[PDB]
Write a protein that binds this ligand. Structure first.
Ligand SMILES: [Mg+2]
Lengths: 129, 115, 98, 92, 107, 87, 92
DNA sequence: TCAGGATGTATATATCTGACACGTGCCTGGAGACTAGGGAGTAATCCCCTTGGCGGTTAAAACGCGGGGGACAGC
DNA sequence: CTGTCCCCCGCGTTTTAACCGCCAAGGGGATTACTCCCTAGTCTCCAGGCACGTGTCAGATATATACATCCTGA
């Protein structure tokens, strides 16, 4: 039901929550758009799978992704171990400040227009008292 | 999603060998297995119950991740050569070159007072 | 109306059934959690062999079953067939457990 | 190595009910049974000798320990058996 | 060559030396650690003292100045933990605690 | 619930009403009053506290962190409840 | 001659209730009390050594034996007293 | 519910003894000094087993609910 | 022995957590090597403790006397 609903061009919702272990594989979605990672990955391949769910043959829009890592923490540690694990992929392939809103908006920008939209939002964040 | 096969020790793998008469098998995966190397072997063994001599034979047989060009390129070249007729792999770049961008970016954030 | 057995018929069937069989009667994972919690009150960060837990459960069920046997007997003594807390407490008091 | 009495229990079984086998679970039970009895007898013999201010456990102490451990006729037969075994042993 | 007993060294009222010998003569193990009989003697003293305290209290309650078996019984049976410790012990001439069930008593 | 699971009950509640009933059936109990279930849990809890306390004491003595079957056996043996089958 | 703890029990009594005396029957009870406790602790310490495949009984084994013998507060205080005694003993 | 009375319990006073507290001489068992050697402590490896979580099914637990049988109060 | 009422049991329906399989890290339970120091063994000395007498007073026992306690007519 959900998968068909994701495919529905007039989807009421714009986002959905997925299990890394389950949803990471279970999705054919060329109407996918942006991906946000929270779980982190002890085995980088699962992220590669989850990440690339968003762009399969037929994918029309530019995909953007995010990985939310906390500053000075165990997540950085795990992340770096995952980065080390990626080396084997290279072996196969060859065989054959951080919260600056403007900056964040730049990394998330497709056009300066979105920055402008957020500007209005932050002005609203200010407007709320 | 043969990636799941991973460790031949699993019950899944075990019971598959007990499916007996299956005269022709095929594995689909989006990626090679864990960086240790035995996993790759296990799948290759699973697929073709011939490729073996030790579960961890690759640690010596293709001792590249475990000299420069010599231990790298030549060994992984032969890794390729022996796996050339067993692994089929192409990249989306090679196939299409139509992915809109590199579609990549990570971010970092501070903890709240509570956190 | 649908068939209904006279209350107690089923009870006797269960008694025969459970006395005849030998398997454990308490769900293992619930049992483990109980054990682990209790263990935390003497020392934290303990591990258990899975067989250690099994040893605890074999003993635990043996204990409770024996208790129920004696409890049942007490109820009978008082001309009842329904066991009550009073019978459990008595049985333990007579045994010298309290 | 982890010695046990499994082989001895096994042999005994085959001298009583030659066709009957035994599960490994039952075997471990029998193993712990033997250890239990051994300890009980030895334990009694130990303090028994101690009670008489003696330093050596002999067959006399083991015998008495059996009489002080096993119930009724069971004890009588165990004593009879032990006596016989020792008799033969010392002869040979 | 000034002598000083181990009991006096430890500051205990029990014969640490005797205890040490007993541990060896009782064959509890092959070897007996130097700190073993000391530790043990202290425990023996501790328990002894606590019972005697309670026994003396019982004697005072009965206006006696000498501890008798009855007092020992009262002491042990009244204290919860000592009762547990000596739950399987019959004390000669101790008797039983005063105790009549309310079901037997008049209404 | 959906918004918040709120499913934390208790580990003692892991011993269910029917689990207790089954034990009683093996015991030979024909009929069980409703207060038995709570009383039984209380009794079991105590039983385990005593055995576990002994078992972990043996574990601490041996300077280990994993409680073994033999430690449990020793605990039970200490209390006069020798258990066969676990070495 | 036959040794006992009579004089040690007596001294302890004097250290608790100086004025209070003690009957010979009460004393014989206390004597057998001490022996009982001694044996229980020593017995447990003994098997602790066997359980760990060791052969020396030290204050560690005795301490544990106390924890495996005395209930609640008795254990807590007995252990405390044992600790202090050994501490002072080895300190001086 | 209350006073009288019979019994029983408790309480002060001798008094009397034998059991406990205490002094003394002996002697063997405990302390001191010294030596050997092996048991226990301690470091370094390794790898098997434990733990935490998730996925997915399904027997079982929970829950309501009528109604008859036992618990129980009375006599 | 009798009445009565209440509450536990049988049973259908629905929900849910146990069971099993999987995955990943990793950390304590084992091994071995080495060393050192703690205790068994032994010999010598000496006073702490034990058996034995000996005094004396704490509690047992009479002995007379004052109050609590239980049963009953009122
Ligand atoms: Mg696929």
């Amino acid at each position: 039901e959900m998968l068909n609903a994701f495919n529905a061009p007039d989807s009421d919702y714009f986002c959905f929550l997925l299990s890394t272990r389950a949803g990471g594989l279970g999705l054919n979605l060329q109407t996918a758009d942006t991906v946000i990672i929270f779980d982190t990955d002890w085995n980088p391949h699962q992220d590669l799978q989850a990440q690339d769910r968003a762009h399969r043959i037929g994918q029309k829009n530019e995909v953007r992704i995010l990985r939310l890592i906390t500053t000075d923490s165990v997540e950085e540690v795990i992340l770096e171990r995952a980065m080390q694990k990626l080396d084997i992929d290279g072996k196969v392939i060859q065989a054959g400040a951080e919260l600056d809103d403007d900056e964040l908006n730049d990394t998330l920008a497709r056009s300066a227009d979105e920055k402008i939209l957020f500007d209005k939002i932050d002005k609203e964040r200010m407007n709320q008292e | 999603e043969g990636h799941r096969m991973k460790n031949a020790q699993s019950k899944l793998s075990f019971t598959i060998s007990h499916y007996y008469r299956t005269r022709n098998r095929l594995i689909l995966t989006g990626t090679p297995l864990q960086n240790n190397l035995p996993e790759l072997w296990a799948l290759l063994n699973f697929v073709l119950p011939k490729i073996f001599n030790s579960a961890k034979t690759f640690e010596d047989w293709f001792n590249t991740p475990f000299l420069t060009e010599e231990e790298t390129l030549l060994i992984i070249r032969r890794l390729h050569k022996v796996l050339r007729p067993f692994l089929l792999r192409r990249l989306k770049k090679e196939v299409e070159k139509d992915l809109p961008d590199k579609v990549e970016k990570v971010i970092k954030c501070k903890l709240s007072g509570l956190q | 109306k649908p068939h209904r057995y006279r209350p107690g018929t089923v009870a006797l069937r269960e008694i025969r059934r459970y006395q005849k069989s030998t398997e454990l009667l308490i769900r293992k994972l619930p049992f483990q959690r109980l054990v682990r919690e209790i263990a935390q009150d003497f020392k934290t960060d303990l591990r258990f062999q899975s067989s250690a837990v099994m040893a605890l459960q074999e003993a635990s069920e043996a204990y409770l079953v024996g208790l129920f046997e004696d409890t049942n007997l007490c109820g009978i003594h008082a001309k009842r067939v329904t066991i009550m807390p009073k019978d459990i407490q008595l049985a333990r008091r007579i045994r010298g457990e309290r | 190595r982890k010695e046990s009495y499994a082989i001895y229990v096994y042999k005994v079984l085959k001298q009583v009910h030659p066709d009957t086998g035994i599960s490994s679970k039952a075997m471990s039970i029998m193993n712990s049974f033997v250890n239990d009895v051994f300890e009980r007898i030895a334990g009694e013999a130990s303090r028994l000798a101690h009670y008489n201010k003696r330093s050596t456990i002999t067959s006399r102490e083991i015998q008495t320990a059996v009489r002080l451990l096993l119930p009724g006729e069971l004890a009588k037969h165990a004593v009879s058996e032990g006596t016989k075994a020792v008799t033969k042993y010392t002869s040979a | 060559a000034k002598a000083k007993t181990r009991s006096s060294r430890a500051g205990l009222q029990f014969p640490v030396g005797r205890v040490h010998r007993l541990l060896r003569k009782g064959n509890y193990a092959e070897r007996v650690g130097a700190g073993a009989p000391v530790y043990l003697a202290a425990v023996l003293e501790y328990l002894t003292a606590e019972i005697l305290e309670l026994a003396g209290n019982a004697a005072r309650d009965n206006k006696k100045t000498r501890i008798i078996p009855r007092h020992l019984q009262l002491a042990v049976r009244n204290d919860e933990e000592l009762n547990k410790l000596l739950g399987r012990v019959t004390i000669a001439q101790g008797g039983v605690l005063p105790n009549i069930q309310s079901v037997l008593l008049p209404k | 619930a959906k918004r918040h699971r709120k499913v934390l009950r208790d580990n003692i509640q892991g011993i269910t009403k029917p689990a207790i009933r089954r034990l009683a059936r093996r015991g030979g109990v024909k009929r069980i009053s409703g207060l038995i279930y709570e009383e039984t849990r209380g009794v079991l809890k105590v039983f385990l506290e005593n055995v576990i306390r002994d078992a972990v004491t043996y574990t601490e003595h041996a300077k280990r962190k994993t409680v073994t079957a033999m430690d449990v056996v020793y605990a039970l043996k200490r209390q006069g409840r020798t258990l066969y089958g676990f070495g």
